[PDB]
Amino acid sequence: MKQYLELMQKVLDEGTQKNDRTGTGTLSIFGHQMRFNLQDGFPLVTTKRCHLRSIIHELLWFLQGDTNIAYLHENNVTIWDEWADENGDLGPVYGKQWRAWPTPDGRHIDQITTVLNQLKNDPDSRRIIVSAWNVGELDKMALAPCHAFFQFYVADGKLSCQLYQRSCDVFLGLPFNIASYALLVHMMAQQCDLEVGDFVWTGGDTHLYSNHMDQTHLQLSREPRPLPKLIIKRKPESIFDYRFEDFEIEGYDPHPGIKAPVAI
């Protein structure tokens, strides 16, 4: 997509060298923002083929509050394999915090349920937020949340979402992250009888891994294509009742997929 490729090019051009957690090294910038008007099309990158399969199942998995990879495996999704323990557990990552954020008194908070009720009852609220950044549970997580903090907003019958992504693997992660949140906006909009607005993406440490440079030059050599259209085929009873088969992407015409190794 134009803004995605612009970001890639910017990291290449302006990023500074970082030694990082993984020992791989990156080129990195700090602070970026992009805006995707979801009525212009579904923001699935077209300069490499992205598999919506993994994106969809990961999102449904988050929504069901699951942090064990068994569900993902049932659906042939292997994207979380490198960080799961012997029992397939990741600890209290994304899903757990979205659906069951724990408090010291032993209670749990369902942020997604809160958000739906906020959108339906108080759409003008400036407090329609989900955080995965549960400081007190970081030490138990396989990875600290990358897509850490997000907000919804409603105007003129349209639902927008902004994500604060503290850490972004521009090549591997970002295409997924953008599509995932765009999908979520479509789902919540449907449940709330709203139209879709913008997805606003904000990055913190926004980087290209040193071992993704060939892949980056290959992708940058490619021109984007018009965005596909998301079709939701069935409206379920609640935001927690979607299934993979509910979603179709029409008019997705990508360039070929590009393979690159993940930094562990």
Place this chain on the structure above:
Amino acid sequence: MKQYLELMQKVLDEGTQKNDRTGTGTLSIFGHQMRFNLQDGFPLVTTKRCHLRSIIHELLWFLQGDTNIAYLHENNVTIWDEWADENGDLGPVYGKQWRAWPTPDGRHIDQITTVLNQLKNDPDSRRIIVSAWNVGELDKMALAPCHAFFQFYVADGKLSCQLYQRSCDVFLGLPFNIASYALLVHMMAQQCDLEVGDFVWTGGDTHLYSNHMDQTHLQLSREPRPLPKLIIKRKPESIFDYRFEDFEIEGYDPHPGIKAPVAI
């Protein structure tokens, strides 16, 4: 400042009329980002006279972990009066979350010390975060945190910080927010023997109150003056040991103050 006036004009150009919690009404956009290179000068609005004294005392108050207005009153700062209970308490707002985030297992995390040690020991970490958005304690707070989530970054010996401000009263709040975080970057940088980088400001619901419009137009008619310069006179042994008289602002030549009512 140019960035600040440009934001005001962006709200005017793109914003939509929204009802709000306070019953005042706003003109609102969703999603913005701007940058202040702190080496250019200290980003205190010059197109109206701002009260650095309140800004400084508020930040020292946060850093102490305090959430009661007594200290503010002792220093003739009244900016939190409208939300405090009969005993002066705001509940577990910023200060508390910054210094003593409660974990589910009964620990407390001092996020400010955590970040200081991360910057000293592992500045290329992508996890150098402070969150005030403690989902389990929101209900106890007089207001939900506006300046909600922030991240530090280091490159070429310079400390940067990005704030995600979920809700922004552009006329009243934002000048304070920008100056407060800029001060914090300087303090943090001092403690870490770093130079200052950028403060990156990102907004969620970014708005002008209905009853700030006269004031906004007036301010927009004015040319920014040179940025003032911040001089820190002392290096305390701890980030929690700064005093009011450690800070001086030099060369601040603002246009006249502009009064406006706060929405409760």
